[PDB]
Every structure is written in structure tokens, then in C-alpha cells.
Amino acid sequence: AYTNSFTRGVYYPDKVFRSSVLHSTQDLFLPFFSNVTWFHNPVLPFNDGVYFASTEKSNIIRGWIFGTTLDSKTQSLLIVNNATNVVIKVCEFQFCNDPFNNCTFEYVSFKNLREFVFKNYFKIYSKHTPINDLPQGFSALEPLVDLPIGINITRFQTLLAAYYVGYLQPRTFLLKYNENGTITDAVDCALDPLSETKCTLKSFTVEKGIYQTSNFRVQPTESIVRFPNITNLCPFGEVFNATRFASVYAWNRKRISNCVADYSVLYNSASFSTFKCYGVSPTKLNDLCFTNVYADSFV
Amino acid sequence: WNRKRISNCVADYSVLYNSASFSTFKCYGVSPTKLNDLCFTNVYADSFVIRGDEVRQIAPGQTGKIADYNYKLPDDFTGCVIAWNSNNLDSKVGGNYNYLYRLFRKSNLKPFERDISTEIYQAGSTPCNGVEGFNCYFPLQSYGFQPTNGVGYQPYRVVVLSFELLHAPATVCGPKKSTNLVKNKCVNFNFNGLTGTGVLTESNKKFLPFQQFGRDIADTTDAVRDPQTLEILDITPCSFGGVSVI
Amino acid sequence: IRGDEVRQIAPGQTGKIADYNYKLPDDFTGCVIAWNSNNLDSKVGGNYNY
Amino acid sequence: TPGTNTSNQVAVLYQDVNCTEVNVFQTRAGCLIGAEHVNNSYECDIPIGAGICASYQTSQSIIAYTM
Amino acid sequence: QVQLVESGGGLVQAGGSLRLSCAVSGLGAHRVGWFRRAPGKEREFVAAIGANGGNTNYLDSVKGRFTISRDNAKNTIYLQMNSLKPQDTAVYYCAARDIETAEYTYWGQGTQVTVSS
């Protein structure tokens, strides 16, 4: 079953104290009114970022796992809470498919929902909302820690009564900075035409009228390459496939130019015992140019 | 390459660049002469030893086999790159081969990425699938370090101080000492390395625990929380006005 | 000077020979010329007059 | 759109593109989506182009009528 | 250049541990490897180690039961045959790489290893 994310996907993009200004920010964000998986444990993809929302009063879920292979002996970020302190580690502790060495990093330090934003060095944001489960009101997240790892991540997992996960998207967002300096309202710049107008006019009030806002630039469906027929091929066969050839002293030099250099037979074919060249790629020869070439044949 | 965090301290880069031991010392986006008086949020030191001929490629924007598949800097990097001859302490007679480097990979390395995975490189048409052989080269290739070779093949020790100059509470602040807090008068203030002129006055602002300084619509600093005391300040510019003769 | 610090003999460059012994103006106009002279400079056992 | 102080509804006009290439009313200034075409004519409230104008009226929606 | 010569190949009983040791000329900067020609099959990988290296890979057939060693002192290499099951008989060879476009640039003429059940 799935649930909507009414207005979640905005954190504080910067550390400055902004006040009384409609400020524009662009970053990876989760679009407002987007779908999340209403999970009641499994493995999920990771594209650019992740959002998280946990429904629990007893701290059931305390950590996460990350990485590409997500298997033992593979570098993974491990955040864990031991009920006495919270630990952040990069130790790939042995984990099977459903978990309930070479340690490199270490760090030890119903009523509410925790919202987490991840992106890639690593970033973390969160904030808490003491509620008497998801109100549709404004949501902004405060950065927590940005601990670097310098490693590729394309997937992740969870540690272990429900939670919500949603994927952030590249977008443009605008913030109503008040006198108080916090965030009280933000409007998407790609949800609905009124919102796009609010952003382009850069205000929360639009007086009646036509307003040109942006463009409709269609994207291409595919990329086409067209050229003349492959004719004509150089006679490399004559030099290579010659039954009779001239001896090492009497070698035949064949000048070659104005030819389609089909290097495929030379290197795609594995029959030839030695294919040696220095300063030029044996596999990329089709991608290089030579004005004039000569060929010598002997035994 | 190992990454050692440098933070929660005070630094002195003047001795580091002045010393004659550093035959190579190149700074990008900052000039060393004024490193002493500007503070930084975090400094990263990455240590790795490269062959001599490939020092000049490791710079933002440049490529090369190690520059591409082994270590690469952002094209917009800020900081300094440091290198020097290391035959004396590292290279041993008879050949030093305890060092390796990755040469062939399917994809290039994006900024600050480290790869130590150990699978063969598939270069041929047919997948190797764990077979070593023709067109199946393991990516790691060792350095052949003989203490007598030419400097072009000699080992240079390298550390990259990537100065991450960020707007955040800074940690490594440089040697320059403080001066007593001044208020309600025109002064050339300098907090955490931001050079400014204006009158300090306490503000009504309340910062979020990670918040450091505010801003104005014209991208001019308008408030700062004092570094050694949580003093919210208002950087009002000193009075000025046009004068016209009659 | 040694060839190691020929980099320093340029307007704008920073080095001990540039800073404390000879500094070209930042607006220098002219040609800087250098060549080796070990045939008349280096000797048996070397020279300490420089 | 009318003012946000009056309504949150909106209409959209695509300039110089026919609207088979994107209830729906097509003008000589492109095709309009989000406002009902009306045969009746009224005064000019919001210009659109080539004569058509848009307005907010009573259930209560946005209309496109010849000036 | 670098030249390879092999020693220590012969007939041994099933389960026997033999010593194959191949000598090289001017080695030190090349990832040495051991290879075998099966009577009915072409050459296949056995073991490979870099200079002063721990980079070890073995085929699943040789997994857990053959290890190679590098002296770095006597200019020769050692491969550990343990309980060699009979169907692993072949002619063994050494090979190394400096810069290659084929499997490996320099090879060893090798020798014969035979096992009787």
C-alpha cells in the first residue's frame, strides 16, 4: 500500500540565518504531494537521495545499511544505536539477506515522526514533530551531520511498527523566510501552474492577470546517425591473406591511403598470435586517424 | 589513499610552505601568503605516493590514467597540492614493490572516490568471469621502485590539503590572535576570517544551533554570532552620505 | 643561483631568493636570461663564494 | 489566473502550438486548457490574444469568450 | 629482457605434494603467474601474485588447495601443490606482464607434471 507525501522534501539548503525574504533554493528535493511506500526490513533502490519517516513510539528502527553489493566484506555505512549510545561506523559486519571487520570509521554519542534526508560527501538532515500520523503542513529539515566516506552508493537497506520512504528529485523550491528566521511555508516550482507562477513572480500573492512563466521545450525521443554506405573497403586481405609472400630481405611494401580502415579483422579476430603496438590503442584503432600507412610482409 | 580529518585545532601553514623540503607546493583558489589569518570549517589530508612522472597531471581539470581511474580532484577544487621526492625514506635497494595503483576500470572516478574492490578487469569480447588471462588484466599494477632510477620514475610523496572553506562554525583558525570585543564604533572587524568594516550592535536574532552568520538581500553579512561567546550581533555599516557644495 | 630556483626569478613568484634577496617588480618590463656556466663556475671540490 | 485573493483556480495557454500536440478551446493565440469556452460575449477582463479574454464568474470557473 | 625457465615438474602419486619452482631473469616489476596446458584443453589460469604482493586469486578447481609464493630474494617463484587430485595433471608454465596487449608479454617454456592414481 502507498501513501502521499503532502509537503515533504525541503530541508535548510544552507547554514545562514535568513529572515523576512522570499528565498529561492535549488537542490535535490522530494516533490510535495508525492507517493511513498507505506511499509508496515526489505531492500530498496537508491537513485539520488532518500527520505524517511518512521511510525514508532518504542524506537523499533534505530539504524540503516548502505552500499552497492550490500554484502559482507563490502564497504557499507553502518549507523546503529546500542540503547546506551548511538554509533556510526563503516564496518561491514557480517550481514545475511535479513539481518536483525576491517573497521575504518567510528563515532559514539506515536507522538513524533523523524524525517531523514540523505544525499551524496554524505549528508544527513532531520527534525522532530511532537504530535498528539502525517499532517499536510509545512516541513523543513535541519542538518545533523555530514560525515564523509568517499564511496559509491547505489542501494541501501534497513535495520530491525511501520515507516515511510520516498525518493528525492532535482527541483527548484522557494522559502517564505519570516522575521523569526525559520521556515513556515515553501512552494514547489514544478507541481502545478499556480505554484510555478508563485515561483517565477517570486511572491505568495499573484494579482489577477495573464503571467508568462516559463517555456515548453520538448525533449528529443532518440539520437540518429546517418552516413553513406560502408563502401569501399581497403584490400587488407591482399596483404594478410597472401599465399605467396616475399622473404624477410625481399619484403613487399604496400602503400595504403584513401581507405576505410577496417581494423576489426586485425584485432576483433583472435586468430592472429601477436597484436602489438605502443602509443596507440589496439582496441580503439578505428577511433584514430593516419594520413598514410605502409605494410610489410615476411616470415 | 587514506583520509585524515584535521579539525579542533590551530594551524600554521607558513612553516609547511616555507620549508625547502617541498619542491612541489601548488595552491588552487587560495594564495598561501594569507593562509595564516583565515579559518576553515574542515581540512582534509589525503596521503598517497605516486610515480614521479605523474605529479603535474593531478590538478583540477587535468586527466591521465591515474588522474582518471585512480584519483581525481573536482574541476572546481579549492586548496593546495603538496609533493616532494621520497626515494630517501621509502624506496629500498633491490626494488620497492609494496605499492600498487589501479590502471584500468570500466568507469572513471568522480571527485574524492576511493576504490579498493578486487575483481579482474574485463577488456576482451568474452567475459573473464574471474579468469585471469589474455585481455583479462587485474587492475592493480605495482610500482617498480629502484633507488637508482631516474626522477621521472622516482616516488613523490603527496598530500592534498583540500581547504573546504564553508559557511559553518570553523575549526582550524590559523595563528593570528584575538582582540577584545569592541562595540558601537567603527572598526575593521574580522571574525573567523571574514574581513569587514561596520558597527557591532546586539541583534534580536536567535540562531539555530548550527547557524553561524546571517545575510542581507545584497549578499552582505548582516549578523554574526561571536565565535568565543554566543553574542548575536548586527553589522550595521558606518554612517556615510553624499556631500554637495552650494 | 642554482637552476632549482629559476622559477623564482619572475615577477609575482614567491621564493626565498625572490623574497629576501631579489624581487622583480610586479610590473616588470624586460627580458630575464639564464644559462649554466659549470665550465667556469663549478670546480674541483666546488665553490663557496656564492 | 484570477487573483489568489479571489480564487486559487488557474488556466494555461500554450503559445502558437496547436492543442492536439499536448475543457479545451483553441484560439489564434494557441490553445487554452483549464477554462470553458463560452459563445456569449462580455467586456475585456484579462487579455489573451486575437480577441479572446478570460474572466472569473459563476460552479464558479474561468471562461474564454470573444471580446 | 626477462627470461623464464621452470624446474621441479615430474610424476607424483595421487595426493602428493610436489615442488614446482621456475627461475626468471631480471624479475621484480611483473605480476608472475602459473599456467597449465590440459591434455585436452588450452591454457587456463592457476595463480597470480604481484611483486611483494598479497593480491591472490585462484580458480575454484585450485581453490583452497594450491598457493603460490614469491621469494623476492632468489629470483624464482614457488607454487604449493597439496593433495593434487589426479585429473589436475598437465604441463605447467610461468608467465609475467610488464605492459601487455596479449595475455602476458613474457612466457615460460615450462615443464610436465603427471599424477598417477
CSV table of C-alpha atoms in Angstrom, one decimal, chain B residues 24 28 50-60 62-63 156:
chain,number,residue,atom,x,y,z
B,24,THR,CA,56.3,20.9,-5.2
B,28,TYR,CA,44.3,26.4,-6.1
B,50,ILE,CA,52.7,8.5,-6.9
B,51,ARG,CA,55.3,7.9,-9.5
B,52,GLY,CA,57.3,11.0,-10.4
B,53,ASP,CA,56.2,11.5,-13.9
B,54,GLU,CA,52.5,11.9,-12.9
B,55,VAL,CA,52.6,14.8,-10.4
B,56,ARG,CA,51.7,17.5,-12.9
B,57,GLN,CA,48.6,15.8,-14.1
B,58,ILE,CA,47.0,15.7,-10.6
B,59,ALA,CA,45.4,19.1,-10.8
B,60,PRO,CA,41.8,20.2,-11.2
B,62,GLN,CA,43.6,17.6,-16.0
B,63,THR,CA,43.4,13.9,-16.9
B,156,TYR,CA,56.9,11.6,-4.9
